[PDB]
Amino acid sequence: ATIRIQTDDFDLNAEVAALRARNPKIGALACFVGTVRDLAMELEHYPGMTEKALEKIAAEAGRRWPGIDVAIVHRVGRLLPLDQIVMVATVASHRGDAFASCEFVMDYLKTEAPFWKKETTPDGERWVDARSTDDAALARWGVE
Amino acid sequence: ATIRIQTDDFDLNAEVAALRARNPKIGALACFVGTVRDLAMELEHYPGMTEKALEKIAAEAGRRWPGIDVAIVHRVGRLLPLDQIVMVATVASHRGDAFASCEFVMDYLKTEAPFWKKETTPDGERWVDARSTDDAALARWGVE
Numbered sequence: 001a002t003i004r005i006q007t008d009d010f011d012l013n014a015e016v017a018a019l020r021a022r023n024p025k026i027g028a029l030a031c032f033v034g035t036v037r038d039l040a041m042e043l044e045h046y047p048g049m050t051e052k053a054l055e056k057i058a059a060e061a062g063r064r065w066p067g068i069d070v071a072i073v074h075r076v077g078r079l080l081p082l083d084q085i086v087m088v089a090t091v092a093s094h095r096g097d098a099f100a101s102c103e104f105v106m107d108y109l110k111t112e113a114p115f116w117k118k119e120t121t122p123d124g125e126r127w128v129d130a131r132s133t134d135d136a137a138l139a140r141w142g143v144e
Numbered sequence: 145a146t147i148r149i150q151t152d153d154f155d156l157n158a159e160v161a162a163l164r165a166r167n168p169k170i171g172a173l174a175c176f177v178g179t180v181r182d183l184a185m186e187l188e189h190y191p192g193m194t195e196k197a198l199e200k201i202a203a204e205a206g207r208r209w210p211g212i213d214v215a216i217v218h219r220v221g222r223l224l225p226l227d228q229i230v231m232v233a234t235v236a237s238h239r240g241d242a243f244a245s246c247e248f249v250m251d252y253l254k255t256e257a258p259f260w261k262k263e264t265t266p267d268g269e270r271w272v273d274a275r276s277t278d279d280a281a282l283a284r285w286g287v288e
């Protein structure tokens with residue numbers, strides 16, 4: 001369960017190869033990459049706190065789908081349109097568990113991991129909670 | 145809808161970048177890579193026929209989730225343990241459609257795309273239908 005928050009960009013290929021190297025006997029790999037939509041974003045985490053939340057999310061995915069492995073890399077800092085934001089990769093013996101766990105981790109990440117976005121309000125620059133709400137995902141995964 | 149069957153190996157990064165370059169305004173990308181499990185595999189397709197089936201699968205994904213784009217690269221030939229077999233990548237405005245369409249394409253590919261595996265039987269070398277059966281996926285996607 002390799003989880004990282006960084007400012008540098010990540011290499012999906014390299015992260016996928018390392019996950020496979022840690023899981024020599026299973027071969028179904030699902031991944032997700034989110035990128036700043038071209039519709040600047042300044043993202044900040046809570047050092048230590050946010051990583052622990054991501055570790056808890058990956059651990060819960062492992063409880064629900066025994067035998068998977070999970071990698072998460074999330075960026076922070078000043079991110080431009082088209083920049084990569086986050087990648088989640090999971091591996092399993094079969095594609096069903098790989099897809100489900102990858103989407104579960106993304107849903108839980110987007111709704112619960114502590115991140116903040118900088119926004120300029122009339123008072124001035126503020127940091128606004130970047131967590132999303134997804135009520136259909138919560139019902140899907142059995143939580144209220 | 146870029147669909148290819150080839151003997152050469154593929155580069156997930158390069159394929160993902162090209163898909164994003166064809167979809168400048170949406171940023172949620174889901175992908176799947178299947179690899180020969182380390183438990184040689186000789187895979188063959190039906191030239192023309194198999195590509196058309198993959199195109200039909202991607203078109204149906206586009207009918208179900210308007211606004212997505214889909215890329216499929218499938219390998220054939222003599223594939224060793226740990227070799228990449230197949231990649232499917234989808235992009236959408238939001239992660240829900242990206243994940244669902246990617247899994248749908250993989251399920252339909254694995255159960256319906258014409259591929260054959262070489263096997264040595266008592267009579268001798270034979271080519272056996274490599275399509276899988278998934279009855280839970282068929283129910284999930286509304287087909288009987």
Ligand SMILES: [Br-]
Binds near residue numbers: 002003004
């Ligand atoms: Br790490």
Ligand SMILES: [Br-]
Binds near residue numbers: 033034035085
């Ligand atoms: Br995202």
Ligand SMILES: [Br-]
Binds near residue numbers: 028094
């Ligand atoms: Br599979």
Ligand SMILES: [Br-]
Binds near residue numbers: 146147148
């Ligand atoms: Br092509």
Ligand SMILES: [Br-]
Binds near residue numbers: 178179230
């Ligand atoms: Br596969």
Ligand SMILES: [Br-]
Binds near residue numbers: 238
């Ligand atoms: Br998203």
